[PDB]
Design a protein around this ligand. Structure first.
Ligand SMILES: CCCCCCCC/C=C/CCCCCCCC(=O)O[C@@H](COC(=O)CCCCCCCCCCCCCCC)COP(=O)([O-])OCC[N+](C)(C)C
Ligand SMILES: Cc1c(C(=O)Nc2cccc(C(F)(F)F)c2)cc(-c2ccccc2)n1CCCN1CCOCC1
Lengths: 189, 404, 169
C-alpha cells in the first residue's frame, strides 16, 4: 500500500495540525520531486488512486488543502480504488472519484469554493471520472433519502450547477452524460 | 436472565471515551471515511461457542418472555442471529425438514402395507416384505431418539414453564406423545395384542400433525401456524363451552317432548346427533314422529337454528377482537422467539470444534491493554452511515479506512 | 392437431381457461376494479399455497391413517383415491357416513374423523382470520400503490406501440 510520508501525516491529525507537514514540504523543496512526492498515488489494489490531496479534503482540513493546491498536487486526481467503488461493486463510499467531487460529496462547501476559484490550478466542474460520473452525477450517487442528506445535496447540486453556468455559459453541466447514457436527472430516476 | 433492558442495552453498547480506561468499552470504532464509520461491537459473553455460559443462550432459553422479544434486537443480537443464519443456521434447518418429512413418509408406508392378522404378522420371507420390516426399524429409530432429544433437553435446559407454550412448549409436549405411542405400538406389535394397529394409527395422526413445527423459520407460514395454536386454545375452548350450554339444553329438552315407546324412543345417542344434522342442513325432521306438541317442538327447533347461527357468528367476531390484528403484531414477536430458538438448538447440537469453525465476527487487535500487551477480542463489525454529525474522527483503531 | 394426434382437446381446453383468466389484465383501467384484481393475486400467490401447505399435511396425515382402519382386501382396498373422495365428501356437509366398511377398530375411526372435522374448520377459520389481519390491514393502502404502478405501465405500453410521428402528434 504505497503510502508516502505526506499521506501518513494527513491520516494522523490532532487539532488538525500534525506540525511535520509544512516542514516535510520544505525538505521536499530541497531534494525536489514535488510533482511526484505530493502526487504519489497508493499503488494498492484497494486504494489505487488516492493521493495526499484526497486525504486532506477527507479529514476536513482546508488549510492543508491550500498548501497542496498551491504546490499543485494533482487537482483532478482520480481515486480509482476498490474501497472507493459503490456499495454494489464491493466498495463502501462512492464519491465520483475526484477531489472536487470528494469535496462536494462530504458536505464541504469551502473547499468547493477553493478548488474551483484559486490562483493555482483549477478544478473545472465538467470533468468526468473513470465511469463518466461528473460532480453532479456523484451528488446523485450519495443521495440516501433521509432528511439531512437531501438538505445539503440539493444545496450543493445548485451551487455546482450555477457556478458552471457563470464560468462556462455555453454549456449546461446537466447534459454531460454518464457512460451508461444517463443524465443527472435520469440517474436519480 | 432477569429481563432488564435499560442496563442490558447500555452494557452491550458501552463506549468509554477517555484514554485511561478504554479496555472497559464494548462498542469500539474501527475506521471512518467521511459519512461511513465501522462500529465494532465486542462479543465476549454474547457468542461463546461451548466453553462458557452465554448471553445469547440465556436470552433465548432462560429469560423472561415479557421482555425477551425486545432484548433480542438491541444492537448486535439481531445481526448476530442473522449471521448465524446466513451461515450454518438456515442450511442445516432445511436438512431436517427434508429428513423428518421422509421420516414420516416411510412411517406412512409401514401403516398402509401392513397385513393385520391376529398374532404378530412377522414371517416376511419375501422380496416385498423386508421393506416393511426395515421401515419399522427406522420408525423405532424415530421413536427412541425423539424420546431422548425431548427429555434430556427438558430437565437440563429450556425451562419447561407454563408460559412458553407458544415458544416451543406445546411442541415440547406433542413430540413426547409421538414417542410414547410408537413405543406402546411396537410393544403390542411384537407381543401379540391385536390393538397394536390402533395404537400405531395414533402416531400417524400425531406425527404428520407434529410436522407443523418445521414451518418455523419462514415468517410467511410461520406466523400463520401461530394462529393455529392461538385460535384453537384461547377461543375454541370458550366457544365449545357456550355451544354446549345449548346442546345439553335444547337436545335434552326436545327429546323430553317425545313419546317413550309406549322413530319411537330410546335412541338418545342418535337423537343427540339428529339435532346436529338439522343445524348444518342434512336433517330430516322425522324426529317429529307425531309427538305430543308439534307446535312447541318446531318453535324450539327454529330457535336453536338461530342461536347456533348467533354463536357461530359470535365465534367469528371473537376471532376479530381477541384475535386478529392486535395478535398479528404479537405473532411477529413470538415468531422471532421461535426463530431464535431454531438457530440455537442447531448451534447447541454441533460439537465444539465444528461450533468454533462457525464462529461470528473476527479476532481484532482492539487497543493497548493496561500492562502493555495487545487486547485481542472477538469483535463483530456493524457498519453505519451518519450524515449529520460531521465529526467522525475519534479513537480509530485502524487508520486505513477499509476491510482488507 | 396438425399432426395425427387426437389429444388436441386436452391442451386446447387448458388454453381456454387461461384466455378468460388472462382478461383480468384489463381490469387495470379502473381503480376500483384494479385494486380488487390485485388482492385476488395476493390471496393466491401469498395466502393460498400457505393453506395448501398445511392442508396437505393433514390430508396426507389423517387420510393416510384412516385407510389403515380398513380391511386389506381379505369396496375392500387398492382404491385410496376413492377414499380421498370419501374424506372430502364428509367435511363439506355432503357425506353419508357409509364409508365405515366394518373397520377393525370402529370407534377409532369416529374420533379421528371428527377430529378432522373440527380441526380443518379452524384452518378454514384461519383463512378467514390470518388473511384479515395480514392483508387488508395493509393492502387497502398498499394495493392502491401497486395499481398506480400498473396503470402507469399500461399508458407507457400503449404509447410505445405507436410509431414516432404518431407519438409526435
Ligand atoms: C447460498 C449461500 C449459502 C451457501 C451454503 C452455506 C455455506 C456454509 C455451509 C457449510 C456447510 C453446511 C453446514 C451444515 C453441515 C451439515 C451437517 C450438520 O449440520 O450436522 C450433521 C452432523 O451433526 C452431528 O451432530 C453429527 C456429529 C458427528 C461427528 C462429527 C462429524 C463432523 C461434522 C459433520 C460433517 C461436516 C459438516 C460440515 C462440512 C463443511 C448432521 O446432524 P444435524 O444436521 O446437526 O442433525 C440435527 C440435530 N438436532 C436434531 C439435534 C438439531
Ligand atoms: C423432529 C425433529 C428432527 C428430526 O426428526 N431430525 C432428523 C434428522 C435426520 C434424520 C432423522 C431420522 F431419520 F433419523 F429420524 C431425523 C429435527 C428437529 C429439529 C431440532 C432443532 C431444530 C430444528 C429441527 N426436530 C424437532 C425437534 C424439536 N424438539 C425440541 C423441543 O421441542 C420438542 C422436541
Amino acid at each position: 500500500t504505497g503510502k508516502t510520508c505526506l499521506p501518513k501525516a494527513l491520516l494522523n491529525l490532532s487539532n488538525g495540525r500534525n506540525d511535520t507537514i509544512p516542514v516535510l514540504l520544505d525538505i521536499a523543496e530541497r531534494t525536489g520531486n514535488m510533482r511526484e512526492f505530493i502526487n504519489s498515488p497508493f499503488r494498492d489494489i484497494y486504494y489505487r488512486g488516492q493521493t495526499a490531496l484526497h486525504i486532506a479534503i477527507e479529514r476536513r482540513c482546508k488549510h492543508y488543502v491550500e498548501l497542496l493546491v498551491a504546490q499543485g498536487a494533482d487537482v483532478h486526481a482520480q481515486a480509482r480504488g476498490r474501497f472507493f467503488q459503490p456499495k454494489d461493486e464491493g466498495g463502501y463510499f462512492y464519491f465520483g472519484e475526484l477531489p472536487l467531487s470528494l469535496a462536494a460529496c462530504t458536505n464541504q462547501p469551502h473547499i468547493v469554493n477553493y478548488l474551483t476559484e484559486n490562483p493555482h490550478k483549477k478544478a473545472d466542474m465538467r470533468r468526468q471520472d473513470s465511469r463518466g460520473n461528473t460532480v453532479l452525477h456523484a451528488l446523485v450517487a450519495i443521495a440516501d433519502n433521509t432528511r439531512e442528506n437531501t438538505k445539503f445535496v440539493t444545496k450543493m447540486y445548485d451551487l455546482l450547477l450555477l457556478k458552471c453556468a457563470r464560468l462556462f455559459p455555453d454549456s449546461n453541466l446537466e447534459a454531460v452524460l454518464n457512460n451508461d447514457g444517463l443524465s443527472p436527472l435520469m440517474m436519480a430516476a | 436472565k432477569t429481563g432488564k433492558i435499560g442496563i442490558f442495552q447500555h452494557i452491550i453498547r458501552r463506549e468509554v471515551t477517555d484514554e485511561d480506561t478504554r479496555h472497559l468499552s464494548r462498542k469500539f470504532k474501527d475506521w471512518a471515511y467521511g459519512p461511513v464509520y465501522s462500529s465494532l461491537y465486542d462479543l465476549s459473553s454474547l457468542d461463546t461457542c461451548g466453553e462458557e455460559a452465554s448471553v445469547l443462550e440465556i436470552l433465548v432459553y432462560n429469560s423472561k418472555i415479557e421482555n425477551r422479544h425486545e432484548m433480542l434486537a438491541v444492537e448486535p443480537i439481531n445481526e448476530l442471529l442473522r449471521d448465524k443464519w446466513r451461515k450454518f443456521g438456515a442450511v442445516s434447518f432445511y436438512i431436517n425438514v427434508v429428513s423428518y418429512l421422509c421420516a414420516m413418509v416411510i412411517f406412512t408406508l409401514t401403516a398402509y402395507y401392513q397385513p393385520l392378522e391376529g398374532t404378530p404378522p412377522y414371517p416376511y420371507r419375501t422380496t416385498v416384505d423386508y421393506l416393511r420390516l426395515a421401515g419399522e426399524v427406522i420408525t423405532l429409530f424415530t421413536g427412541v431418539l425423539f424420546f431422548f432429544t425431548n427429555i434430556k433437553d427438558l430437565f437440563m435446559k429450556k425451562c419447561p414453564g407454563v408460559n412458553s407454550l407458544f415458544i416451543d412448549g406445546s411442541f415440547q409436549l406433542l413430540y413426547f406423545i409421538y414417542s410414547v405411542l410408537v413405543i406402546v405400538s411396537a410393544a403390542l406389535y411384537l407381543a401379540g395384542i391385536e390393538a397394536y394397529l390402533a395404537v400405531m394409527v395414533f402416531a400417524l395422526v400425531l406425527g404428520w400433525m407434529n410436522a407443523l413445527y418445521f414451518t418455523r423459520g419462514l415468517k410467511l407460514t410461520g406466523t400463520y401456524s401461530i394462529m393455529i395454536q392461538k385460535i384453537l386454545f384461547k377461543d375454541l375452548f370458550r366457544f365449545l363451552l357456550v355451544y354446549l350450554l345449548f346442546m345439553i339444553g335444547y337436545a335434552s329438552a326436545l327429546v323430553s317432548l317425545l313419546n317413550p315407546c309406549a322413530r319411537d324412543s330410546e335412541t338418545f345417542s342418535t337423537f343427540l346427533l339428529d339435532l346436529f344434522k338439522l343445524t348444518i342442513g342434512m336433517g330430516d325432521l322425522e324426529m317429529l314422529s307425531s309427538t305430543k306438541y308439534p307446535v312447541v317442538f318446531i318453535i324450539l327447533l327454529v330457535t336453536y337454528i338461530i342461536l347456533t347461527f348467533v354463536l357461530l357468528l359470535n365465534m367469528l367476531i371473537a376471532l376479530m377482537g381477541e384475535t386478529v390484528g392486535q395478535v398479528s403484531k404479537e405473532s411477529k414477536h413470538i415468531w422471532k422467539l421461535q426463530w431464535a430458538t431454531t438457530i440455537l438448538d442447531i448451534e447447541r447440537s454441533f460439537p465444539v470444534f465444528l461450533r468454533k469453525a462457525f464462529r461470528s465476527g473476527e479476532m481484532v487487535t482492539v487497543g493497548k491493554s493496561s500492562d502493555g500487551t495487545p487486547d485481542r477480542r472477538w469483535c463483530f463489525r456493524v457498519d453505519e452511515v451518519n450524515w449529520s454529525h460531521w465529526n467522525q474522527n475519534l479513537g480509530i483503531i485502524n487508520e486505513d479506512p477499509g476491510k482488507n
